[PDB]
Every structure is written in C-alpha cells, then in structure tokens.
Amino acid sequence: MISGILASPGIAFGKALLLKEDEIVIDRKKISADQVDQEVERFLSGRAKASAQLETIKTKAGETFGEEKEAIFEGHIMLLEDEELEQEIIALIKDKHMTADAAAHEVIEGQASALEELDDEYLKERAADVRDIGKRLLRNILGLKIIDLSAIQDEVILVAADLTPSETAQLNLKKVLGFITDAGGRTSHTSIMARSLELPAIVGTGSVTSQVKNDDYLILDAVNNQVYVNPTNEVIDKMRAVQEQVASE
Amino acid sequence: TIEIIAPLSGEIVNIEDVPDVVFAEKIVGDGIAIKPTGNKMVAPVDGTIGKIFETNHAFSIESDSGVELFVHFGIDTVELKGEGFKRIAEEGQRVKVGDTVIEFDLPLLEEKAKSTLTPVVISNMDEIKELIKLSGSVTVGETPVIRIK
Ligand SMILES: O=[P-]([O-])[O-]
C-alpha cells in the first residue's frame, strides 16, 4: 500500500533503474605551506575537468530540450567561473591552509547558506541549483565515477530519491518510460517536466527506491496510484482488461 | 532591417532592470522588458510558434526572417501553475504579427505574480548584426520594440 502525489496520470510497464551515489568524504586534515601551492593546482586541475565536462552537458541540453535549458547551464558555468570564487577559494587555502575540497565547499555552501536564510520558497529552490554546482565540484576534484544517465542502451523506468536540473538535461526521454522519485512534491522543473512532457510519473513516493533494486520489473498504474513489483501473468492480464476499459472511456 | 513588434502593450523597460539575474545578465539572450497594461500576448513577428510552456505563460517563436525570440510573461510566473493564462495558439502554429498566442488576467497576476515585467529577448544573438533597442509606450502588435540588422 504505497501512495505518492502522482504528477502525471497514465500507465507504464518496464524495468526499474536505481541511481546509487557514494557519500562524498571531506578531509578535515590541515595542509602545510608546501602543500598550499599543490592544493591550488589540484583545484585548478580538478576545476579544469568540470569546466570542459559542464560545457558538454550544456550542448546536450540545447539540442535535447532547447535554448530554454541551454542558458541555465551557462549561468551555472558563468557563476562557477566568477572571479569572486577564484579569489575566495584560493584565499582560504592560502590564508587558512585548508584543503581545496573543504575550502571550496565553504565558499559555495556559504553563499547557498545565505540564500536559505531567505524566507521564500522560490529563492530557496534556486539555492538548491547553486548547491548542486558545488556538490559536483567536490566529486570533480576527487574524480569520482559518474553514472551519466545518457549511457542507457535499454528502455527502463527512472527511480531516484530526487533529480537535480542538471540530470534532466542529459536525460534520455525516449529510453525513460516514466519518472518516479521521493522528492518534496513540486521540485524545481522536474516534477514540472512530467506535467509538460505528459508522461506518467510520481514524485512523493516517500521510500520506493529503498524497496526497488535496479533491473526490477515494475508496473506504474498512475491511475490507482499503486506500483506492482514482480506481478504474475494473471495479475497483468487482470490489469490489461482494466486498461482496455480506460481506452474505451 | 527587421522590426520586432510589441508582443504586449505597456512600457518599455531595460532588461537589466528585471529582478532576475538570468534575464538581467542576458544569459538567455538580449532584448527588452515590458511592464504590461493589456490582456494578451501576440506574435511579435511572422514566423512559427516553437514552444509554449506547459504553464502557458511563455513562448518561443522563430520569424521567417530567421530570428529566434523568447517572450516570457512576468518573473517566476511558472510558480502560478497556469493560473491567469490561457493558451490560445498551438505549438508549431504559423503566425503573422499580431496573432494571439495567449491571454492573461492582469489584475490577478498583478496580485499574485512576483513581477509582471515581461522580457522579450533574442535567443539568436550570435546570428545578428545589430540590435537597436527602442523606448517608450507600445501597443500590442503595432508598435516596434527592437530593430535588428
Ligand atoms: O522557464 P520557466 O520558469 O517556465
């Protein structure tokens, strides 16, 4: 008996994809002066990657969705290259002898943290987009493996605790037969995408991803607001007869 | 020279004065804003509608002359979930200047929207020789707002 908010009504049958992410480890160890110059280079070298990789995601958004989604990446990229971040990230490492992943986190977290103090739900969501930029930056310096939702060769359903605007751009709409997540509800443009895309999807599942493993076969009712996990053929036949009634209706 | 006609009635405003860094910083393209005073949004050029937001509050059109425009009513208006707007046209529709695309409820939006400021931007900046921004009061589907070469 699992119920969500249902963002788009419809029905779908397919395998379940699970987005697993390892927790990012931050080093609280302080660096020495000789390590100050090396840590800055690591940041620049790590920042050098995300610079080119972020640009690749932008081009996919323009062709995939359009100029409406292409410019959002330019803002995120332009904000990341802000000359204020370069001086502030380097100053803490040089002044506080802190690590690049720990020092850089404070800079992006510091601004996003200021935005959360705001008493507006609209300003808070944008703070989520800015937080995402720094979150991936830590992975880029460490060089953590990225699943990339573009590497999908088979049709599957997309299940995740929550998706960030960046994933929605490099997402395969034709290979994803639906979207299911336990986010808050409206979420940024995601839950909104199901509405505009007109595809069945849930965003308030609450804890479905913890009950689903990748490669699981799931059927989305998006009509009775229920999910069937590994149902026998007799159950599908019964569900198919109901679908025929809906088509007639 | 291409003349962009006012997609809504109102007063021209600087795009830099729009309470949104993405528009103000023209990340999305360059153009002008309009403080609206009417009830409808029309085609600012002869061309084809491209995309209409599912909240029916913004749209894309490409002129026959090859210019890509993007008219977005108000600031953060998607948060209203379609309230106060009515899609009149369809995506892919061929239109002539002045054709109605969407009608809106001003008073409602004036009350509910963070801002009714309406950017009108060129999303094709790299394909244009010059953008000359006009000034003043405009009248829907009549008064030119931008001149391009
Ligand atoms: O781009 P948008 O806020 O619908």
- Given A76, A97, A105, A189, the catalytic residue: A189
CATH 1.10.274.10 fits A21-146, yes or no: yes
The enclosing H or E element of B2 equals: strand B2-5
B51 and A195 within 8 Å at the Cβ level: the answer is no
Nearest-angstrom CA–CA distance, A180 and A203: 6
Structure tokens at B23: 């528009």
Which of B20, B21, B28 to mutate to probe the A interface, most A CBs <10 Å?
Answer: B28
**Residue B75 and residue B114 in contact, taking contact as beta carbons nearer than 8 Å:** yes
Domain boundaries, chain B: 1-149
User: Could you tell me the distance, in angstroms and rounded to a whole number, from the CA of residue B77 to the centre of ligand 1?
Assistant: 7
SS3 of A119, please? Answer: coil
Which residue, A142, A147, A111, is CA-closest to A129?
A: A111
Chain B residue with CA closest to A78: the answer is B27
Detail the residues of B annotated as belonging to a binding site for Zn(2+): 57, 72
H-helix segments, A65-120: 67-80, 83-96, 100-116
Chain A residue with CA closest to B52: the answer is A196
- Residue listed under structure tokens 């599957």: A156
Nearest-angstrom CA–CA distance, B148 and B63: 12
CATH number of the A1-20+147-249 domain? 3.50.30.10
Q: Report which protein residue has its CA nearest ligand 1's atom 2.
A: B78
Domain boundaries, chain A: 1-20+147-249, 21-146
As a 3-state breakdown, chain A gives helix, strand, coil percent values, each rounded to 5, of 50, 10, 35
H-helix segments, B25-145: 106-112
Q: What are the E-state strand segments in B54-141?
A: 58-63, 68-72, 85-87, 94-95, 100-104, 118-122, 131-133, 137-138
Q: What is the CA radius of gyration of chain B?
A: 14
Which residue, A148, A187, A147, A183, is CA-closest to A165?
A: A187
User: Could you tell me the distance, in angstroms and rounded to a whole number, from the CA of residue B78 to the centre of ligand 1?
Assistant: 5
Structure tokens at A144: 């953590």
What was the experiment behind these coordinates? NMR
Q: What is the CA radius of gyration of chain A?
A: 21
- DSSP codes, B6-59: PSS-EEEE-GGGSS-HHHHTTTT-EEEEEEE-SSEEE-SSSEEEEEE-TTSSEE
The enclosing H or E element of A14 equals: strand A12-18
**Residue B46 and residue B95 in contact, taking contact as beta carbons nearer than 8 Å:** yes
Detail the residues of B annotated as belonging to a binding site: 57, 72
CATH of B1-149, one of 1.20.120.1810, 3.40.190.10, 3.90.850.10, 2.70.70.10: 2.70.70.10
Of A71, A122, A195, the CB nearest to B76: A122
The verdict on B19 touching A (C-beta cutoff 8 Å) is no
**Residue B128 and residue B148 in contact, taking contact as beta carbons nearer than 8 Å:** yes
Does A189 participate in catalysis according to the annotation?
Answer: yes
**Residue B124 and residue B83 in contact, taking contact as beta carbons nearer than 8 Å:** no
- Residue listed under structure tokens 């109901």: A242
Q: Which residues contact B118 (CB under 8 A, 6 or more apart)?
A: B7, B8, B10, B33, B34, B35, B36, B71, B72, B73, B74
